Structure formats: C-alpha cells, structure tokens
Amino acid sequence: IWGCSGKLICTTA
C-alpha cells in the first residue's frame, strides 16, 4: 500500500 518512486512515479509535466 504505497502512492511513489518505487510503486508508480507521479507524472506531472
């Protein structure tokens, strides 16, 4: 149970 650099990176351009 993670949001992350590890689970799935937060794509924000």
Curated annotation (Swiss-Prot):
Subcellular location: Virion membrane; Host cell membrane; Host endosome membrane
Disulphide bonds in the chain: 4-10
UniProt membrane topology term: Single-pass type I membrane protein
Function of the molecule: Acts as a class I viral fusion protein. Under the current model, the protein has at least 3 conformational states: pre-fusion native state, pre-hairpin intermediate state, and post-fusion hairpin state. During fusion of viral and target intracellular membranes, the coiled coil regions (heptad repeats) assume a trimer-of-hairpins structure, positioning the fusion peptide in close proximity to the C-terminal region of the ectodomain. The formation of this structure appears to drive apposition and subsequent fusion of viral and target cell membranes.
Subunit structure: The mature envelope protein (Env) consists of a homotrimer of non-covalently associated gp120-gp41 heterodimers. The resulting complex protrudes from the virus surface as a spike. There seems to be as few as 10 spikes on the average virion.
Protein name per UniProt: Transmembrane protein gp41
Organism: Human immunodeficiency virus type 1 group M subtype B (isolate BRVA)
Taxonomic path: Viruses, Riboviria, Pararnavirae, Artverviricota, Revtraviricetes
Full-protein interval shown: 591 to 603 of 852
